[PDB]
Design a protein around this ligand. Structure first.
Ligand SMILES: CCCCCCOCCOCCOCCN[C@H](O)c1ccc(NNN)cc1
Ligand SMILES: [Cl-]
Length: 290
């Protein structure tokens, strides 16, 4: 599994900040837009993009405050990322897109797709943001840690000061051991603790047990839209997973229209880091059908 990030940096101005993105493949055709989440960056797509770049344009932005993108003075709420990603999409002049989305990026993709259904030709997703109406539906092994994360004293102490989300939560979202090179690639944007605000605000935006209300409403909305959308869907899942356990993935695969489902084997949250070969191969093959 590759550790290197061999991509020339691209930068675009958006709402006064500079956003970094990978842009490879042919200039023409329908672009494939890769959206990462917390606590990663476009580095999480480094081994999947090369299966798609031979025949399709690949665009992979770094969310604002993450990756190589600018890090302004923000609360980094979900709405901030919504604004910035909308402006990024409109600044690259994209009309029709195929979405490949993960974690909070999925929330960004889905919420974009619901508002622009005519502009989405396909969605490939995995370990995505779904409503969790009670804490019982959250994974037991992450319950205590993510409840502690959702406070302004202990949560900020763990995530902001001690970098627990990068040094602990991130490698526990991967079955196989991450190497020190990959760990350094994930550490790079957050070496300065004051730059760790998104790492803390993201788990505090998670829609668990009705809080926060706005995110619960929004995520419920795009799930309702997805359940009746004819958009072609490609769902990846792993064992035991984090945000999507196998039983939920099977339920969704049976209920979602035009949905191909793929079990990647052992996997937690960062499915890209456990089985990139299968994910990239399946995405290339599935794109061949849009
Ligand atoms: C917004 C997107 C969602 C982000 C979710 C992040 O995912 C992590 C969630 O789990 C964290 C709580 O885990 C506690 C128990 N974990 C086991 O101790 C453990 C230990 C080591 C390994 N791997 N070693 N290579 C795997 C598991
Ligand atoms: Cl999170």
């Amino acid at each position: 599994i590759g550790t290197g990030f061999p991509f020339d940096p691209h930068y675009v101005e958006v709402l006064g900040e500079r956003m970094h993105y990978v842009d490879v493949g042919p200039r023409d055709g329908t672009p494939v837009l890769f959206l990462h989440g917390n606590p990663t960056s476009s580095y999480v797509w480094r081994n999947i993009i090369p299966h798609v770049a031979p025949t399709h344009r690949c665009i992979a932005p770094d969310l604002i405050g993450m990756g190589k993108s600018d890090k302004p003075d923000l609360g980094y709420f979900f709405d901030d990322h919504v604004r910035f990603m909308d402006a990024f999409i409109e600044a690259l002049g994209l009309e029709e897109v195929v979405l490949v989305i993960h974690d909070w990026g999925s929330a960004l993709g889905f919420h974009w797709a619901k508002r622009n259904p005519e502009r989405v030709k396909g969605i490939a997703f995995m370990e995505f943001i779904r409503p969790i109406p009670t804490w019982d539906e959250w994974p037991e092994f992450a319950r205590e840690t993510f409840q502690a994360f959702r406070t302004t004293d202990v949560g900020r102490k763990l995530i902001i000061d001690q970098n627990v989300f990068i040094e602990g939560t991130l490698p526990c979202g991967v079955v196989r051991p991450l190497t020190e090179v990959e760990m350094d690639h994930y550490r790079e944007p957050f070496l300065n603790p004051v730059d760790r605000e998104p790492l803390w605000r993201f788990p505090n935006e998670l829609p668990i047990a009705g809080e926060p209300a706005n995110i619960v409403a929004l995520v419920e909305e795009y799930m309702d839209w997805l359940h009746q959308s004819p958009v072609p869907k490609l769902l990846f899942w792993g064992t035991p997973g984090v945000l999507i356990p196998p039983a939920e993935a099977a339920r969704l695969a049976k209920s979602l229209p035009n949905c191909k489902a793929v079990d990647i084997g052992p996997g937690l949250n960062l499915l890209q880091e456990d089985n990139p070969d299968l994910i990239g191969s399946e995405i290339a093959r599935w794109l061949s059908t849009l």
